[PDB]
Design a protein around this ligand. Structure first.
Ligand SMILES: [K+]
Ligand SMILES: [K+]
Ligand SMILES: [Mg+2]
Ligand SMILES: [Mg+2]
Ligand SMILES: [Mg+2]
Ligand SMILES: [Mg+2]
Ligand SMILES: [Mg+2]
Ligand SMILES: [Mg+2]
Ligand SMILES: [Mg+2]
Ligand SMILES: [Mg+2]
Ligand SMILES: [Mg+2]
Ligand SMILES: [Mg+2]
Ligand SMILES: [Mg+2]
Ligand SMILES: [Mg+2]
Ligand SMILES: [Mg+2]
Ligand SMILES: [Mg+2]
Ligand SMILES: [Mg+2]
Ligand SMILES: [Mg+2]
Ligand SMILES: [Mg+2]
Ligand SMILES: [Mg+2]
Ligand SMILES: [Mg+2]
Ligand SMILES: [Mg+2]
Ligand SMILES: [Mg+2]
Ligand SMILES: [Mg+2]
Ligand SMILES: [Mg+2]
Ligand SMILES: [Mg+2]
Ligand SMILES: [Mg+2]
Ligand SMILES: [Mg+2]
Ligand SMILES: [Mg+2]
Ligand SMILES: [Mg+2]
Ligand SMILES: [Mg+2]
Ligand SMILES: [Mg+2]
Ligand SMILES: [Mg+2]
Ligand SMILES: [Mg+2]
Ligand SMILES: [Mg+2]
Ligand SMILES: [Mg+2]
Ligand SMILES: [Mg+2]
Ligand SMILES: [Mg+2]
Ligand SMILES: [Mg+2]
Ligand SMILES: [Mg+2]
Ligand SMILES: [Mg+2]
Ligand SMILES: [Mg+2]
Ligand SMILES: [Mg+2]
Ligand SMILES: [Mg+2]
Ligand SMILES: [Mg+2]
Ligand SMILES: [Mg+2]
Ligand SMILES: [Mg+2]
Ligand SMILES: [Mg+2]
Ligand SMILES: [Mg+2]
Ligand SMILES: [Mg+2]
Ligand SMILES: [Mg+2]
Ligand SMILES: [Mg+2]
Ligand SMILES: [Mg+2]
Ligand SMILES: [Mg+2]
Ligand SMILES: [Mg+2]
Ligand SMILES: [Mg+2]
Ligand SMILES: [Mg+2]
Lengths: 93, 46, 271
RNA sequence: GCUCGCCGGAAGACCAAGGGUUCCUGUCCAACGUUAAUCGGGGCAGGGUGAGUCGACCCCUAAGGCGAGGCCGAAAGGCGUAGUCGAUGGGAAACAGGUUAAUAUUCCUGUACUUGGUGUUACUGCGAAGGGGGGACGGAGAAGGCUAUGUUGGCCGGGCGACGGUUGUCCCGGUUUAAGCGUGUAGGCUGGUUUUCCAGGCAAAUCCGGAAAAUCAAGGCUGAGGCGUGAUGACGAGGCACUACGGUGCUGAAGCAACAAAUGCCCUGCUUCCAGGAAAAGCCUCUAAGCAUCAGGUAACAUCAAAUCGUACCCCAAACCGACACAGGUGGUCAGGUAGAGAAUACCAAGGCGCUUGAGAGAACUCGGGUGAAGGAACUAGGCAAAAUGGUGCCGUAACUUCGGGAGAAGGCACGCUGAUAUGUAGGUGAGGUCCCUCGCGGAUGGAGCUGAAAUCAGUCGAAGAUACCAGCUGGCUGCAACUGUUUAUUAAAAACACAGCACUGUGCAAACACGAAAGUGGACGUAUACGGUGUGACGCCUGCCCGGUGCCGGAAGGUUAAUU
RNA sequence: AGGACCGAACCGACUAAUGUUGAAAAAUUAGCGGAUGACUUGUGGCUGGGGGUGAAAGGCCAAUCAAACCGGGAGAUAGCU
């Protein structure tokens, strides 16, 4: 059983985009920004407990952070993990 | 024409990488020289 | 059988091959096979220590019984086989107890013959006996040098050893080199000559045939530069030196044996 | 947007490596882009990579690395045992359709599959670090069965033609569908079963090996493809309906057959050859210590788990390696039409491009080409370069020869199209029908339909029929090297090196020899028909004299002679 | 059957021209040799500088080779410019 200490830290932000809205309006799927070491089992346990919906399946991917320039200075944004959480057909979070 | 540098990440790490440097005393002296100069990159590992 | 190829191409004109229809055409006996990958003449320092070794066909090692220890148990020859590791052919034998084993195939031994080792064996080819039980004057092969060590002398195709005298605990052997050697009389030996005596009548015919056997080309010292070889140098073809090895030791007549430990067993050098 | 041109065994498509946001959208044109740029692989901002099955990780090992102890070495360290790493190899499982501006075997729809944990119900000898089996292996060749795929007809939809003709032996398009499951075929291999006994498999074995039997004659293994199902589905020419003129939405016919056919599959086969062709695990099985009405094994249903990381884009290239948006380099997969022997070549398809300066002019001269009177090597160091020859079938072919060659020697003839033989032949393929059946994915007979060389005769057009592209110049004397090979990466490819063969010589195995303060290691898991060194260089006929010099080998009496005493 | 024949891929580099501040620090075009083998090629490994490796050209060992490269002795020494 995943500790509630851990569950309150894995979910970071909703991800807002046109792909994220289509996935909600067509496939009952929320797109989340999650912690970089969060597993698929942790994301499922945290969505079901904190958002109080029922989760079909979690798919994840790691977004590689972009190289940017700021005032002739090379930088690089952080990598982050995205999660496509499919809900069970009647939840509508 | 075939030039001298034909990259291979596996061969780059086994020949010049951090664990190859740490494996001999002569390679540990390379790292000691590069830390004393203050190199931002000790090895080809990054 | 010795058969001359027909000159249908210049690399075939001189090939003489030795075809033995008795040798088993199928795969070898797999419990007696091991791996042996090649060295290229390199030692564990990775240096070339024997020149001219490299490539050639892949070969599996055959575990050959040189010791012949299963005494008092009859064995029957199942088949003669090709062995890529050696000049002689080998013979898969079936002991009566169910164990299979490879031996060197002596001259005149075929499938169905009976062989036996030990002190109580008859005197006929393929049998292995301590040499004090073998008569003086006999032709033997696969001869041990230390009792129980396994046979080390007269193993190549067509070779044999004559027992010329037995003086107490030693026997005197005439080796194939012409050398007279004392060996302890309890050392085992197998009666008869080694088979495949037509082995030395093959003619390889072409350069590639030696490359199939792992022999890489020999460059003459006189074709080199002075930095390479003591024979190198000169404008045009020149020699002017006494002939030496690549390491400067004289190579036409200079004797190189120095073993005072085993000198007491050498009755006469080979001349 | 219409036309034109170029590639099409690539200049298309897709991976691996390598790169790392170059991907997609909006916005901007300073710099970058060999010009301008509204455009961009440029700036700026936002978006974008979804996996139990693909790969990595993982289990297993190769070469090799590292290596507890150990052995060795002034120190640093060297080697190496047990072990432990190491893929370029072995090991579980997913396909079709749809969808985004940008991902998809990952999302969705449909239909599947694998392995492990649990909980059970039921029969139960389970159990390894050990045994055995298996995995498990070369080259070449030969043909049979196939499929991918194509072509033609049938089918269905549309057409009736800008200029003479075109209701027809007319035109255009489509005619697609997977993994899985069921069947176990063409074919390949193997004699099955049950007892008895045993010096073998480090001990045990009921397993493997061996000996004897009795009996049974087909039991087992493997296997492309077809067929059925998957599929009343999906896809589908088009038609329609909106268009933010980018494409969406809806609707939807036929969806068969015959022939041709691979380098792909059966096939890790079969045949044959000598140069004799990985390992280990998963898997099958065997018992041991232990466990012993338990745990555990096995089959079934159910139930949970299958994490993590990669996934965008380029990838024969403007994104990799070449300082460049550089005529260079870069492993693997896919492989349509007509002609063709073909992956050559020409023109095309799908698909992609016109190579990031243009506009004129129409001097010399330079580059890349085309043609040339008469002559035809007079050129020149030299026929350098160019010109020429060039296909298939048949006729014909010298010296010499090691009997294979030389030889495609040389030299010649035929070649298009149309008709007949024959409305399409020899051949290939094979339906219906038929019969028999150890009852089928069967056999035998039968030939409809399909496909289809080449020959001869006749006729016919042109200057020319291998019409383009493509595609040997030939012969004579002679040096040298036998030959195929190899070499100065970047001015030398040869007569140089190598070579098979030959000889001398060393070497008796803890071999000579080599690498190494050494331990060791190669030589070699070889053993004088073997291995090292040296010279010579196929083959043929041969290889004469000299031991004074220098070297090597043997001798061992005498002279000379070290440390030591 | 064959280090067999002809010939693409693939590997090589005989001749010529071009190019020579190149398109290219070794290439392009047209020809040319091998093309089942002593063949070619991917990935990984091993041999290290008086050392390696060499079908031997003093070849090659990262555009460097009759002794690599980097750092050090080092401001070597220079009756020479
Ligand atoms: K010379
Ligand atoms: K040096
Ligand atoms: Mg899913
Ligand atoms: Mg993922
Ligand atoms: Mg040699
Ligand atoms: Mg030789
Ligand atoms: Mg030379
Ligand atoms: Mg010298
Ligand atoms: Mg001379
Ligand atoms: Mg002289
Ligand atoms: Mg074209
Ligand atoms: Mg950028
Ligand atoms: Mg773009
Ligand atoms: Mg401007
Ligand atoms: Mg500009
Ligand atoms: Mg951009
Ligand atoms: Mg190892
Ligand atoms: Mg130690
Ligand atoms: Mg070690
Ligand atoms: Mg391992
Ligand atoms: Mg691999
Ligand atoms: Mg894409
Ligand atoms: Mg077909
Ligand atoms: Mg082929
Ligand atoms: Mg992709
Ligand atoms: Mg350009
Ligand atoms: Mg380029
Ligand atoms: Mg290539
Ligand atoms: Mg072409
Ligand atoms: Mg002009
Ligand atoms: Mg001109
Ligand atoms: Mg002309
Ligand atoms: Mg003229
Ligand atoms: Mg004329
Ligand atoms: Mg003339
Ligand atoms: Mg003249
Ligand atoms: Mg003149
Ligand atoms: Mg010419
Ligand atoms: Mg020409
Ligand atoms: Mg002359
Ligand atoms: Mg030659
Ligand atoms: Mg040649
Ligand atoms: Mg050169
Ligand atoms: Mg040259
Ligand atoms: Mg040894
Ligand atoms: Mg000669
Ligand atoms: Mg010579
Ligand atoms: Mg050939
Ligand atoms: Mg070369
Ligand atoms: Mg060329
Ligand atoms: Mg030739
Ligand atoms: Mg050829
Ligand atoms: Mg020279
Ligand atoms: Mg160089
Ligand atoms: Mg020097
Ligand atoms: Mg000094
Ligand atoms: Mg100075």
């Amino acid at each position: 059983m995943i500790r509630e200490e851990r569950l309150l830290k894995v979910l970071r932000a909703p991800h807002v985009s046109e792909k994220a809205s289509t996935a909600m309006e067509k496939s009952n799927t929320i797109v989340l920004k999650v912690a970089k070491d969060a597993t698929k089992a942790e994301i499922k346990a945290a969505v079901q407990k904190l958002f109080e919906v029922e989760v079909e399946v979690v798919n994840t991917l790691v977004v590689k952070g972009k190289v940017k320039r700021h005032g002739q200075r090379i930088g690089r944004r952080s990598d982050w993990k995205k999660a496509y959480v499919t809900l069970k057909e009647g939840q509508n979070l | 024409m075939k030039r001298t540098f034909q990259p291979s990440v596996l061969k780059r790490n086994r020949s010049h990488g951090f664990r190859a440097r740490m494996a001999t005393k002569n390679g540990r002296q390379v790292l000691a020289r590069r830390r004393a100069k203050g190199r931002a990159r000790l090895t080809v590992s990054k | 059988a010795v058969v001359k190829c027909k000159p249908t191409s210049p690399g075939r004109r001189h090939v003489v091959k030795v075809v033995n229809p008795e040798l088993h055409k199928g795969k070898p006996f797999a419990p007696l096979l091991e791996k042996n990958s090649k060295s290229g003449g390199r030692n564990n320092n990775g240096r070339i220590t024997t020149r001219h070794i490299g490539g050639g066909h892949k070969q599996a090692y055959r575990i050959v019984d040189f010791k012949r220890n299963k005494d008092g148990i009859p064995a029957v020859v199942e088949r003669l086989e090709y062995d890529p590791n050696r000049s002689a052919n080998i013979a898969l034998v079936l002991y009566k107890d169910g164990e299979r084993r490879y031996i060197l195939a002596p001259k005149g031994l075929k499938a169905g013959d009976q062989i036996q080792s030990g002190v109580d064996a008859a005197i006929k080819p393929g049998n292995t006996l301590p040499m004090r039980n073998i008569p003086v004057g006999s032709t033997v092969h696969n001869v041990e040098m230390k009792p129980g060590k396994g046979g080390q002398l007269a193993r190549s195709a067509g070779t044999y050893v004559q027992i010329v005298a037995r003086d107490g605990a030693y026997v005197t052997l005439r080796l194939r080199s012409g050398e007279m050697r004392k060996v302890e009389a309890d050392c085992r030996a197998t009666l008869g000559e080694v088979g495949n005596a037509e082995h030395m009548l093959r003619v390889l015919g072409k350069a590639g045939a030696a490359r199939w056997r792992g022999v890489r080309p020999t460059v003459r010292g006189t074709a080199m530069n002075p930095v390479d070889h003591p024979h190198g140098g000169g404008e045009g073809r020149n020699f002017g030196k006494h002939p030496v090895t690549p390491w400067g030791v004289q190579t036409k007549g200079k004797k190189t044996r120095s073993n005072k430990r085993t000198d007491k067993f050498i009755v006469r050098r080979r001349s």
